[PDB]
Amino acid sequence: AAARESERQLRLRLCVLNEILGTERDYVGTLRFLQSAFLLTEENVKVLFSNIEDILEVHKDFLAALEYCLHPEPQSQHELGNVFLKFKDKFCVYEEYCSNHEKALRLLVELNKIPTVRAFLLSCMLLGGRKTTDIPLEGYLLSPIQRICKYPLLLKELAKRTPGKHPDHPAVQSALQAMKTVCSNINETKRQMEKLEALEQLQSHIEGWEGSNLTDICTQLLLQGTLLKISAGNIQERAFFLFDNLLVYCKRKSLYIFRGRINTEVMEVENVEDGTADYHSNGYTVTNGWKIHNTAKNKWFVCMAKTAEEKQKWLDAIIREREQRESLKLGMERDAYVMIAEKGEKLYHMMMNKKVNLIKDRRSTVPKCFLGNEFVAWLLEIGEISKTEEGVNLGQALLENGIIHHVSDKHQFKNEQVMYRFRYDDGTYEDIMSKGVRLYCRLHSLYTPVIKDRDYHLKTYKSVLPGSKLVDWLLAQGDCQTREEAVALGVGLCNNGFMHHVLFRDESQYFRFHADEEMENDFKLVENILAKRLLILPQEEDYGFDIEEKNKAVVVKSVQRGSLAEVAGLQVGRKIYSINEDLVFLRPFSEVESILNQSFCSRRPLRLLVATKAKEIIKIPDQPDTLCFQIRGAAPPYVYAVGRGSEAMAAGLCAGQCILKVNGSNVMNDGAPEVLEHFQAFRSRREEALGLYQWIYHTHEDAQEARASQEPMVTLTVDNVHLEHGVVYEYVSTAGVRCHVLEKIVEPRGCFGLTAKILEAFAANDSVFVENCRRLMALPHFEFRNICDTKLESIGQRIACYQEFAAQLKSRVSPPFKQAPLEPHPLCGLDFCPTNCHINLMEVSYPKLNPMSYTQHCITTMAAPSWKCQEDREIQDAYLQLFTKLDVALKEMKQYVTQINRLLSTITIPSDKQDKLHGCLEHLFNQVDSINALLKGPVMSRAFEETKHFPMNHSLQEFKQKEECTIRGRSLIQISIQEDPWNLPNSIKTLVDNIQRYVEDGKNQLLLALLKCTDTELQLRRDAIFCQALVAAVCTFSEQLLAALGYRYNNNGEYEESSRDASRKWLEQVAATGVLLHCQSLLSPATVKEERTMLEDIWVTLSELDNVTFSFKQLDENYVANTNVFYHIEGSRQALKVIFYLDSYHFSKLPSRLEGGASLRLHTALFTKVLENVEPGSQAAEDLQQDINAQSLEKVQQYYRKLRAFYLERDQLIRPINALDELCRLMKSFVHPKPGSVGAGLIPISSELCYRLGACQMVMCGTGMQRSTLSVSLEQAAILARSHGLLPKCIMQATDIMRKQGPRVEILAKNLRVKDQMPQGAPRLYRLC
């Protein structure tokens, strides 16, 4: 074996020789190419290259000597030290270039700043054949320093390999000394040599090194440390080393042992949650963790750092490196590509000339074919190129650069006279709608008029634009730098049918937009309508209710007994409007039948509308048998249910109906018994006339309550509620197709039950808190505890008030919404429903029976946070968060303790098992230390200071000195493992439980301080306001998600995107990250102080709202009429986990991930700017506006980074992403007060931005009446123009039809007490026209 060891050393020496040979051959080839292609004023060339020729010749002689030395092939009996010494003097050639290198690199930097000389250098580099993208000139230029610093290393290496019997060792050592002296005499080589020697010393500490040497592909030790990992279902602590394109982890015990390393280019970075545990984590919770991949082993692993700061350091460094290298290589390749395109264009045109015309239609005849031979002869002839190979390689690049191609496209570029063709010959070789829409909006958004009526030929033209002035303004805002940009934009606009001359051009010609031409048919109405959304579900054979034509108006034929339609309350004799959100009153009868058949085969959940009126008269037979319904509320009674399969269906009886009069009897104020007695069944028996009947309930809230607890005609005058003032529109598309913008305004169907359940969750949470606080406090000081108990009684009183509000809000049915208060009064259930909530829908219907498209864009409305009847607050929030973190940490620590105890049981062997246990124990100790620090946080210290007036078995100083005890326990664990692993589990339990006791002490003190520093009035107000905001958010997202599940919602139609894909994509985008809420508050804080304070409150309540989290859980019912989304609440304030219980069809369509109830977060976004003209306190209000906008901009930008990262992890996005980037630039400009001119285009532009994203929309205003309808119609109009082919000639046509004719007048129709007015000084785009 020893002979084999000597033979291995011999092989190593041979390897050193072979690599020396290869390196020298490669270097001389580098010099060969550099001199052959390059050797632009000639002084530049000489200064750059200096003395490469003498160096090249020295290396040539050296290589010849070496080659003869290895003659015929390398062996172990050759000598080279003499060859080295002989050239020792010859290496002074390097000094000249080393000195010149500074000037050469500075000159090359200058040239790089020169595009033409740089591209010329690139062309020359590409000519020869070397792929330029591989290496730039700079590496070749700087190579000599590296080569000279490396030769000593090669000498010493070969000396180490050299067998002792071989006498060349002293000679090689002398040569090494000479090379070191030569390197030293030049200080520039000193830096490279010292870096190399330091790296080699670091490697010398590596035991069992593998792979190429570190100095080869590395230059700097970026970072190092210790970091854990999971692998093969096991854990093994490791220390990672960070070198450029190299991640080196070694098994520390020379202090390091090789385990494995990765190349970054085959490396991936993926981040996980703080609290995840999956198969890749082998069911282990993750802290500060992230995922990496080695595609070589095509397996992943997780890396968990000791702290957050450590993880941040690692991510920052690794990113920085990958970012720099990516940017460098992308820039180089793109510059090369653009240069190829430019040169190809120039030369192609030069060939197109008749002079020595090479492009020709020769022979199947091949039009415009050129021979590579004649092409290259011409290129050389013009002096551009000097070698046939240079040109043929360049033509090969062009063919590969998609500039030319073989006639048959079955060959590459060869010097032969092979037929070749350009992509221009065969013809083989957007941002306007958004640009124009914005352009108009911004321009007319200005305060000081700009786009104005002007006198042309002594006759004023209305609202024209001096193209000169257009360019001047475009430059004024940095929107266009040079007049070329503005002129190009104006040319586009002119061809784009937005503006035209009064009779684009860069002079004083005057232009107005076609929209003002319409101002100074294509958008109209058809009808106005009121509807009730009769959500129906499929039955055994049909969807429940047939139809028939009557008065050429689609009407119901009959409703079959025992129908889900009868569940929803579908009558006979009602005109229909929609069927599957698909219009039918503008369609033939048979077409409506086809729509129904298609929905059946698709088994879709219908979302119809109907033609039922605000009052109805009902005649019911009265047998002396049973009531067949119920009633409740001394307030205007509302039918509370109705039997199924009964004449009550026949008579036209439906849940929720609010009876006003019966047989000509005023009851609207009287109680239930009054109407009850009129029925013979009630006369027979008071309550015993309620025969068994499948009871169908107004809301889930009472359906569940009644169901759990249980386990000769009469005229009626019922006043309905929760109706839908449907409008229609019509217009002819820009594509020419026909459209119906079937707007609606629904009121939030499931609104009450949500306020009820949220207040119930508040009550239960407060009750549990009270129970625990009371128990803890029971066991100066006496009066302190008495004060605490008084606070606790106050909490209980708040709980009772919450319960009473729950009862009330269960009682109320009418009116459908909370009237805006005009007077103060004590609290009441109505105070926690949203103030004037609504859902301004939209649709579309134009074919791609025949195919059709659809969409939606909800826009909810709601007044400012309504209530009339911080430092300590942030302290309290800090306590809340600390408690939550501590408890969660205790839970996960217990889980992991169980995991490790099971592992110890399994330990009950190969040393790798001992080492894995060691690493696991180290992780346990690390988590323990983390928890200890969290306990020791200043929040806890202040808490203890607050609790000093209460007896306790632990003190701040006692806890601090417990650190020594914890260190002792850890050392005792170490002693146990050293002596016997069987003593370890007991110490594990001991420490776990002792620290648990510490935790309980801490949270006791935390709760004590919380009570010690809490006030109830502000908390009650805050809960109210959050309740409103969350109600709005929940209903909004309910609507939008329900849209998605129907395969409707579509926020990107400008890319010919089918609805189905848009729905799936948005839904899963949410499931990955979540949803963003855009609150476009339009309040005027400088106007009313009250609205300013309401703005502050809505802002802070949104900030709190961020914590909310949703999740889904199937839920089945046959006992509610027209609500799929049986909402629910649970959890607490800090994390209120709502459950949008959906139904079976509305559960299958849920993406795969969420089907188990996984958190969807919820991000807030608030933007404020007073629509009317700006005209210290108000300065502070404006500053508040700016801060709100800034924070919201940061949050949206972060979500944008997240979304782009998702998609990149997940081509067509180039358009939307660039447009989004421009939008972000616009927003930054707006919010940034860089040196009124911005007007108010922020509102529309930002609305566009959020709609482009997956965001669900929402808007709040002063009073819900005037300041909001305008903005809403504006946004709807812009969406239409941007998404479904409207004629941008009709923009203001739509903008004014809406704000004058459409649903948005029913806000004033159903509401009269409200007080509001339209804007008085708004820009043109807002004011009515």
Ligand X SMILES: O=P(O)(O)O[C@H]1[C@H](O)[C@@H](OP(=O)(O)O)[C@H](OP(=O)(O)O)[C@@H](OP(=O)(O)O)[C@H]1O
Instruction: Catalog residues that contact ligand X under the rule CB under 6 A.
Output: 229, 231-232, 234, 236, 238, 259-260, 297, 299, 301, 912
**What's the 3-state SS for 928-983?**
HHHHHHHHCCHHHHHHHHHHHHCCCCCCHHHHHHHHHHHHHHHHHHHHHHHHCHHH
Shortest distance, position 260 Cβ to ligand X, whole Å: 5
CB nearer to ligand X: pick between 822 and 909 = 909
Nearer to ligand X, 8 or 252 (CB): 252
Q: How far does CA 910 lie from the centroid of its chain?
A: 47
Distance between CA atoms of residues 701 and 806, nearest Å: 10
429 CB-near residues (< 8 Å, 6+ apart) = 402, 423
Smaller CB separation from ligand X, 231 or 1229: 231
Q: How far is the CB of 236 from ligand X (least distance, A)?
A: 4
| DSSP state string for 669-697 | SS-HHHHHHHSHHHHH-SSTT-------B
Residue type, 864: A
Shortest Å distance, C-beta 918 to ligand X:
13
Query: Minimum distance between the CB of residue 296 and ligand X, rounded to whole angstroms?
Result: 9
Beta-carbon contacts of 1232 under 8 Å, excluding residues fewer than 6 positions away, are: none
Q: How far is the CB of 1254 from ligand X (least distance, A)?
A: 37
Token digits for 1275? 């946004």
Give backbone dihedrals phi and psi of 417, rounded to 5 degrees, phi first.
-75, 65
The CB-of-910 to ligand X minimum distance in angstroms stands at: 8
CB of 921 to ligand X, least distance (A): 17
Give the C-alpha separation, 155 to 168, whole Å: 11
Residue entry with tokens 């990516």: 326
The total of other beta-carbon atoms located within 10 Å of residue 127's CB is 23
Our CB check for ligand X shows the closer of 260 and 633 to be 260
Task: Check if the beta carbon of residue 1059 is closer than 8 Å to that of residue 854.
Answer: yes
Beta strand spans in 724-767 (E): 731-732, 738-739, 745-746
Which residue's CB is nearer to ligand X, number 299 or number 968? 299
d(CA 763, CA 1124): 26
Amino acid (1-letter code) at residue 899: Q
One-letter identity of residue 579: I
> What are the φ and ψ backbone dihedral angles of 949, each rounded to 5 degrees?
-90, 30
Minimum Å gap between C-beta 300 and ligand X is 9
Instruction: Return the number of the residue (259 or 500) whose C-beta is nearest ligand X.
Output: 259
CA distance 803 to 756: 9
Nearer to ligand X, 297 or 550 (CB): 297
Tokens of 850: 């025949």
CB of 310 to ligand X, least distance (A): 18
Q: Please say which residue, 7 or 912, places its beta carbon nearer to ligand X.
A: 912
CB closer to ligand X out of 234 and 594 = 234
Amino acid in position 151: Y
- What minimum distance in Å lies between the beta carbon of 297 and ligand X? 6
CB of 288 to ligand X, least distance (A): 18
Estimate to the nearest angstrom the gap between the alpha carbon of 253 and the chain centroid. 43
SS3 40: coil
| Nearer residue to ligand X within complex by CB, 159 or 302 | 302
Tokens, residue 153: 């290393």
Nearer to ligand X, 231 or 680 (CB): 231
Identity of the residue numbered 644: R
Answer for the pair 464, 454: CB distance below 8 angstroms, yes or no: yes
SS3 1077: strand
CB of 1136 to ligand X, least distance (A): 40
Contact 1066, 1254 (CB under 8 A): yes
* C-beta of 62 vs 301, nearer to ligand X: 301
Count of residues for the chain?
Answer: 1329
> Of 23 and 234, which CB lies nearer to ligand X in the complex structure?
234
Beta strands in 740-897 (DSSP E): 745-746, 838-840, 859-862
Give the residue among 393, 368, 370, 390 at the shortest CA–CA distance from 380.
390
**Count of CB atoms within 10 A of residue 174's CB?**
15
* Smallest distance, ligand X to C-beta of residue 988, A: 23
Cβ closest to ligand X, residue 286 vs residue 1227: 286
**For ligand X, which is the closer residue by CB, 248 or 359?**
248
For residue 243, the SS3 value is: strand
- Closer to ligand X at the Cβ: 26 or 912? 912
Contacts of 903 (CB under 8 A, 6+ apart): 917, 920
For residues 170 and 208, which CB has a smaller minimum distance to ligand X in the complex?
208
Helix (H) or strand (E) holding 221: strand 221-224
Tokens of 146: 């590296």
Provide, rounded to whole angstroms, the least separation between the CB of residue 253 and ligand X: 13
Taking the complex as a whole, how short is the minimal distance between the CB of residue 235 and ligand X, in angstroms? 8
Which among 1052, 1055, 1228, 1255 has a CA at the least distance from the CA of 1163?
Answer: 1255
**How far apart are alpha carbons 903 and 1119 in whole angstroms?**
50
